[PDB]
């Protein structure tokens, strides 16, 4: 499914086609309030945000930054911070080399015939960059040209659809321009701010076709209503179902921006792109199966997994994604369970009393001990501790 | 951007490619209670729902149906009713003929089913065939699983259950047609639980049948999860131009009517430009072909007058929610950039004669930059509105 891309590390978090789709969010505090900004960053992480943006405007924004990181290091909380910038960000960065290092990525407006400086600064520091096209950063003569071009077409498009062309052109040109300065494909993420599902889908299918950059998906905004939730899912789902998009933000202006993370997290889970808890699946059963045993087994396993969880979670990162399969026949069980981390298949009609256990390959046959259940949880467990060990 | 299908009338409401997507809702009153159910179909309709499903299962409810329709008619509200039936289906219809005739669509899941296609072909009525889990032939599923195992790359057990469900939906379709029921009166569904599944199943059904498609997720309780999942599931399909009726199913707080799910279905349809809460005025962004900012304030005043006329247009002119009005920043490109507007005006940009064309599909007039412009255009809009919408055009 997934669009291949280079990997762009934002701090410790890999962003790109080979990696899990990340959730991003932003502060809502003025950054300058180190007290209220850091609180909000700690909890957005706990909420599910793996990366966190903050707007950085007057000088008062800057001094605050490196301290904010200086306490997160101590607060255990190892989050990557992203700096939201508008023109004058350079002189800001150039003045305080201390905060350029605290930031883990810069977010900048396009520029095409200050953009130069932002790119230059990032290449010195080794910092990745998101280039986010937007209405405000759009070449007026570009717009006019596109407008003229549109009116020559056999079937000219609407005003609004030309705007979207200009937005895409604006993002692609800035992308080529960052690369032209020497930035690096492993240092470059794109996006374009849109307000409607159709627009988002259309703009990002163009960005996919014309660039190899990882893509950060998001809608401009809406209030905390149903509208806002529905719009974001409506808009993100079609892209994520095609394999386009590497980072996602949900934006619903409301104390904090905390409900946004929930929603983003949900959109990912509805489409099976991230899990919060390990999962046991078992086949439906069909004609090959004699016995309810496989199904009682799966309920038991599932039950005993749901209680190892708060241990497993704190001991073993990534374990939320564990898939366990319990199948109803040996002849078809394994083939219907290829994608399980570990699965077992139970004898069916006219089958030997043996139960194969798979961990991608065959791991072992379980002879019909009464203990099959307990033997299997032991295997799930020894599988878990190996495959989900923290691996320095 | 839409799938071609035959047209299925459910009472007043047309359903298929050529028509706007309609939303089915559902009552949770004892159907037997004429006062409670009647009022609920009314609130469900008024929250914006064109089709209402009532539950008929006892003979006590059967004799309430014709009386439910009669009471809605006396309220002037002509919303079509749909019956779902427990097993007593065919029996209750042949026993209560006027209950049968008060319904407009029959729900069936794949004597039995045949004795229900029979009484629908005899009756002139449309049915929805809704495939589902407890309708899969246990033997087919076993067979499909065998086919799957023999594949160079077998799919997951769940992936096979979805094949069984499509096949089971396609078959019951093929069936009804053979039996003697028109493409005229056949709507198709196959409810599943998860977004990806829904997309895969209805792409299958879209490609393999020719039927109008009723898109819905299985029942889930109210929450972020449920709102999101139904948005995540319906959107990718409705973007692709698939589905002709939609239904969001969320479990309401105790004792309450199923109105919020109607609200979400409308928000889903709205978020994709498949439905409009209220008329809207659109204006170009301005480029380089104009330095005049007058088109914007005209658009602002045009939008500010329409918002003043809607409360009356609502109660007076049906359909007009969907009115699109264009106000453009230049004359040489204005008309082209405003083709999907019901009614459009284009102000002179740089170099242009002090003249502004109004369009309504075609060239209508050229309103001479008399200070009147705002009023003259605004007049032409009303001329249009009374002409297009209201009692049949
Ligand atoms: S694993 Fe075996 S028993 Fe289970 S659904 Fe598949 S073929 Fe049937
Ligand atoms: S209609 Fe005219 S002024 Fe308006 S955006 Fe298009 S070319 Fe530019």
Pocket of ligand 1 (CB under 6 A): A 283-286, 288-289, 327-329, 332-333, 336, 348; B 145, 157
CATH of the structural domain A275-392, one choice from 3.30.413.10, 3.40.50.1780, 3.40.50.300, 2.60.40.10: 3.30.413.10
Q: What is the C-alpha separation between A219 and A157, in angstroms, rounded?
A: 23
- Compute the residue count for chain A: 392
Tell me the two tokens of residue A168: 């895409």
Q: Give chain A positions within 8 Å (CB) of B232.
A: 233-234, 236-237, 267, 270-271
Q: Give chain A positions within 8 Å (CB) of B328.
A: 159
Cross-chain residue pair B239–A201, CB shorter than 8 Å = yes
For residue A224, what is the nearest residue in chain B, using CA coordinates?
Answer: B224
Tell me the two tokens of residue B338: 């405003």
Strands (DSSP E) contained in chain B are 22-26, 51-56, 81-85, 105-108, 127-131, 186-190, 214-216, 220-221, 245-247, 250-251, 280-283, 324-328, 343-346, 355-360, 362-368
Separation in Å, CA B348 to CA A148, B330, B354: 16, 5, 6
Contacts of A392 (CB under 8 A, 6+ apart): none
Cross-chain residue pair B224–A226, CB shorter than 8 Å = no
- From the CA of B164, which ligand is nearest? 1
Q: Which of B232, B283, B287 sits opposite A140 (nearest CB)?
A: B287
Q: What are phi and psi of B5, to 5 degrees?
A: -135, 155
Rounded distance from Cα A325 to ligand 1 centre (Å): 12
Is A205's Cβ below 8 Å from some Cβ in B? Answer: no
Q: What are phi and psi of A120, to 5 degrees?
A: -60, -50
Residue B337 labeled ligand binder: yes
- Reduced to 3 states (helix: H, G, I; strand: E, B; else coil), residue B81 is strand
Q: What is the DSSP letter of A130?
A: E
Q: Which of B139, B156, B333 sits opposite A339 (nearest CB)?
A: B156
- Reduced to 3 states (helix: H, G, I; strand: E, B; else coil), residue A254 is coil
Cross-chain residue pair A286–B145, CB shorter than 8 Å = yes
In chain B, list all ranges with CATH 3.30.413.10: 276-393
- From the CA of B347, which ligand is nearest? 2
Rounded distance from Cα B204 to ligand 1 centre (Å): 23
Q: What are phi and psi of A128, to 5 degrees?
A: -75, 160
Note the helical H segments in B128-156. Answer: 138-150
Is B160's Cβ below 8 Å from some Cβ in A? Answer: yes
For residue B158, what is the nearest residue in chain A, using CA coordinates?
Answer: A283
Q: Please state, as a whole number, how many other Cβ atoms lie within 10 Å of the Cβ of residue B270.
A: 17
Tally A–B CB contacts below 8 A: 161
For residue B283, what is the nearest residue in chain A, using CA coordinates?
Answer: A159
Q: In CATH, what number does B276-393 get?
A: 3.30.413.10
Shortest Cα distance, chain B CAs vs residue A279, angstroms? 14
What is the pairing mode between strands A361-367 and B127-131?
A: unpaired
Method in brief: X-ray
Q: Is A372 exposed, middle or buried (0-12, 13-18, 19+ CB in 10 A)?
A: middle
Q: What is the DSSP letter of A1?
A: -
Protein residue with its CA nearest to atom 2 in ligand 1: A329
Is A197's Cβ below 8 Å from some Cβ in B? Answer: yes
Is A151's Cβ below 8 Å from some Cβ in B? Answer: yes
Give the residue from B178, B321, B185, B241 showing the smallest Cα distance to B17: B241
DSSP string computed for A256-312: -SHHHHHHHHHHHHHTTS--SS-EEEE----TT---SHHHHHHHHHHHHHHHHHHHH
In chain A, list all ranges with CATH 3.20.20.20: 1-274
Separation in Å, CA A306 to CA A11, A278, A319, B239: 32, 8, 12, 38
Q: Give chain B positions within 8 Å (CB) of A141.
A: 288
Q: Give chain A positions within 8 Å (CB) of B160.
A: 336
Q: CA A121, A123, A124, A128: dihedral to nearest 10 degrees? A: 80
In chain B, list all ranges with CATH 3.20.20.20: 1-275
Is A349's Cβ below 8 Å from some Cβ in B? Answer: no
Q: What is the C-alpha separation between A377 and A78, in angstroms, rounded?
A: 33
Q: What is the C-alpha separation between A152 and A146, in angstroms, rounded?
A: 10
Q: What is the C-alpha separation between A204 and A330, in angstroms, rounded?
A: 45
Separation in Å, CA B252 to CA A225, B233, B261: 17, 20, 8
- Reduced to 3 states (helix: H, G, I; strand: E, B; else coil), residue B138 is helix
Q: What is the C-alpha separation between A348 and A305, in angstroms, rounded?
A: 25
Which of A158, A230, A279 should one mutate to test binding to chain B, selecting the residue with the greatest count of B CBs within 10 A? A230
User: A227-254 burial by CB neighbour count: b if 16+ within 10 A, else e?
Assistant: bbbbbbbbbbbbbbbbebbbbbbbbbee
The H or E element containing residue A324 is: strand A323-327
- Reduced to 3 states (helix: H, G, I; strand: E, B; else coil), residue A82 is strand
Give the residue from A279, A167, A324 showing the smallest Cα distance to A175: A167
Tell me the two tokens of residue B109: 């899941």
Strand partners, A129: A106, A188
In chain A, list all ranges with CATH 3.30.413.10: 275-392
Rounded distance from Cα B325 to ligand 2 centre (Å): 16
The CATH architecture of the domain made up of A1-274 is Alpha-Beta Barrel (3.20)
CATH of the structural domain B1-275, one choice from 1.10.3470.10, 3.30.2270.10, 2.30.30.100, 3.20.20.20: 3.20.20.20
Note the helical H segments in chain A. Answer: 34-47, 59-72, 89-95, 97-102, 115-125, 140-150, 159-181, 197-210, 226-242, 258-270, 293-315, 372-387
- Compute the residue count for chain B: 393
Is A336's Cβ below 8 Å from some Cβ in B? Answer: yes
Tell me the two tokens of residue A138: 């759009």
B334: Cβ below 6 Å to ligand 2?
Answer: yes
Q: What is the C-alpha separation between B217 and A233, in angstroms, rounded?
A: 15
Give the residue from B250, B239, B306, B247 showing the smallest Cα distance to B274: B239
């Amino acid at each position: 499914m997934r669009r291949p891309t280079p990997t762009v590390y934002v701090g410790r978090v890999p962003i790109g086609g080979a990696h899990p789709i990340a959730v991003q969010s932003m502060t809502n505090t003025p950054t300058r309030d180190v007290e209220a900004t850091t609180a909000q960053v700690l909890e957005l992480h706990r909420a599910g945000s793996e990366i966190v943006r903050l707007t950085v405007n007057d000088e008062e924004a800057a001094k605050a930054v490196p301290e904010i990181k200086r306490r997160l290091l101590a607060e255990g909380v190892e989050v990557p911070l992203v700096g939201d910038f508008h023109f004058n960000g350079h002189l800001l960065l150039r003045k305080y080399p201390k905060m350029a290092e605290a930031l883990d990525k810069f977010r900048i407006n396009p520029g095409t015939l200050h953009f130069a400086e932002m790119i230059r600064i990032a290449m010195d520091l080794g910092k990745p960059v998101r280039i986010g096209a937007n209405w405000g950063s759009l070449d007026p003569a570009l717009l006019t040209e596109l407008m003229d071009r549109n009116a020559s077409r056999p079937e000219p498009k609407s005003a609004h659809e030309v705007v979207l062309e200009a937005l895409v052109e604006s993002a692609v040109r800035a992308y080529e321009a960052a690369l032209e300065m020497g930035l690096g494909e492993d240092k470059l993420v794109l996006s374009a701010k849109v307000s409607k599902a159709r627009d988002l889908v259309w703009v990002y299918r163009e960005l996919a076709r014309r660039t190899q950059a990882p893509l950060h998906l998001g809608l401009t905004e809406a209030g905390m209503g149903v509208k806002g939730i529905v719009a974001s899912a409506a808009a993100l789902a079609p892209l994520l179902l095609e394999g386009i998009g590497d980072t996602i933000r949900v934006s619903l202006t409301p104390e904090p921006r905390t409900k946004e993370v929930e929603v983003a997290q949900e959109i990912l889970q509805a489409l099976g792109l991230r899990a919060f808890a390990p999962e046991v699946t078992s086949c439906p059963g069909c004609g090959r199966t004699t016995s309810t045993f496989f199904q009682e087994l799966a309920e038991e396993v599932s039950r005993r997994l749901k209680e190892r969880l708060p241990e497993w979670r704190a001991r073993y990162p990534g374990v939320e994604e564990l898939k366990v399969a319990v199948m109803g026949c040996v002849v078809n069980g394994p083939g219907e369970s290829k994608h399980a981390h570990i699965g077992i298949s139970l004898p069916g009609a006219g089958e030997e009393p043996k139960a194969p256990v798979y961990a991608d390959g065959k791991l072992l046959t379980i002879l019909k001990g009464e203990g099959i259940a307990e033997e299997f949880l032991r295997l799930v467990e020894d599988y878990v501790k190996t495959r989900f060990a923290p691996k320095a």
